[PDB]
Amino acid sequence: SKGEELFTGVVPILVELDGDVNGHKFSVSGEGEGDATYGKLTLKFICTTGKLPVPWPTLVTTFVQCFSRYPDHMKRHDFFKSAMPEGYVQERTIFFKDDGNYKTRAEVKFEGDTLVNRIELKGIDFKEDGNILGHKLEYNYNSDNVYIMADKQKNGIKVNFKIRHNIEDGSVQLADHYQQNTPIGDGPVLLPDNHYLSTQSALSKDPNEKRDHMVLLEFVTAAGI
């Protein structure tokens, strides 16, 4: 499509988030690069305001699905790159079961040769000593497919999926994601048939980094068609 050509090589990525969860305000800056040819993302996030007041794993999905590898036979279904470079708005509600919710509004677009994800996050109705504000989640990440359908009325897409965060006691903290993406430009975009993204994420730490941070390595492939 349009932006598909913008992703044939390695693209630098910047992520900027401002958050407020139950009145706890924080900002995060991330940098890395993506290589959509391999569905590959490498990112490092730093909390610039001090200690992150929620667990890092709960922000992975908020912190650029244009880097997904769409198989050649599935190229007409790749909404995300088709909206580039002008980009898209990505909005979610993330419901943490028996706890609060995040609402996020993000704009994903090129600034020059750099793909930028700018996010505002608002979290409300969290429990003071629940799994999120009480930091009871393991620093790890599992799988789960991301389901995408057309929203042929907002000329965008609707995405739904579940994340299961691991609680330190061996249980699971469900995070139900509801997502909508809509192009920023007027340009034509690709409205896909139903399909899913297969995702894998690995979380790590930089041994030399003394700020609160997360290193993220992810691989994403479109499938289901």
Side-chain angles (χ1 to χ4, degrees), residues 1-50 52-112 114-167 169-185 187-225:
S1 55
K2 339 221 329 270
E4 194 266 34
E5 160 219 288
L6 303 163
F7 291 90
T8 48
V10 183
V11 174
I13 300 160
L14 194 57
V15 180
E16 294 288 329
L17 177 144
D18 278 338
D20 172 337
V21 173
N22 279 39
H24 295 100
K25 297 188 169 37
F26 61 100
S27 295
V28 173
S29 289
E31 301 186 14
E33 60 186 37
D35 191 358
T37 299
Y38 311 98
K40 185 177 192 167
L41 285 165
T42 299
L43 294 166
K44 178 176 170 191
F45 303 100
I46 301 151
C47 184
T48 57
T49 43
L52 194 66
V54 299
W56 284 103
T58 70
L59 295 178
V60 167
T61 52
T62 296
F63 295 144
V64 289
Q65 291 173 309
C66 46
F67 290 104
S68 302
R69 181 175 75 83
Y70 275 72
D72 178 84
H73 82 273
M74 284 184 69
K75 271 179 200 179
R76 65 197 252 257
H77 303 291
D78 188 350
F79 166 82
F80 306 100
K81 295 187 184 61
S82 81
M84 299 297 162
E86 297 95 338
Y88 50 80
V89 181
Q90 180 162 298
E91 298 171 287
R92 294 212 181 90
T93 302
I94 303 176
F95 295 100
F96 295 90
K97 173 186 287 322
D98 298 318
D99 210 337
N101 62 89
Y102 299 162
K103 283 176 184 280
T104 60
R105 187 189 187 280
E107 295 175 17
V108 186
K109 67 181 304 276
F110 277 90
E111 294 290 356
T114 299
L115 193 39
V116 176
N117 180 16
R118 289 178 59 136
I119 313 128
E120 326 171 299
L121 175 152
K122 200 167 157 257
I124 64 169
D125 293 332
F126 288 91
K127 293 192 178 174
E128 144 202 346
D129 75 318
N131 296 319
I132 286 71
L133 295 175
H135 296 275
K136 307 185 185 182
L137 296 186
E138 299 175 2
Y139 191 67
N140 55 33
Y141 216 87
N142 327 100
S143 239
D144 206 281
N145 293 336
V146 172
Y147 295 98
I148 306 174
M149 19 177 40
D151 209 329
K152 233 121 187 146
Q153 225 252 150
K154 279 179 228 103
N155 192 42
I157 55 171
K158 292 143 14 66
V159 180
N160 295 321
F161 55 96
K162 290 177 188 182
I163 299 295
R164 294 176 172 94
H165 296 298
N166 298 307
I167 305 163
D169 69 356
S171 193
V172 161
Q173 168 70 67
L174 177 63
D176 283 301
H177 293 57
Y178 297 80
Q179 168 185 343
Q180 78 194 187
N181 294 57
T182 68
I184 293 172
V189 292
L190 296 178
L191 293 178
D193 287 331
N194 295 358
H195 65 285
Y196 65 88
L197 307 181
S198 298
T199 306
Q200 71 165 80
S201 304
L203 307 189
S204 62
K205 300 286 190 182
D206 176 352
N208 297 307
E209 180 58 71
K210 299 307 121 141
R211 297 169 287 180
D212 197 10
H213 72 282
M214 167 170 73
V215 177
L216 175 68
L217 176 62
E218 280 206 334
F219 298 93
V220 181
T221 305
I225 294 173

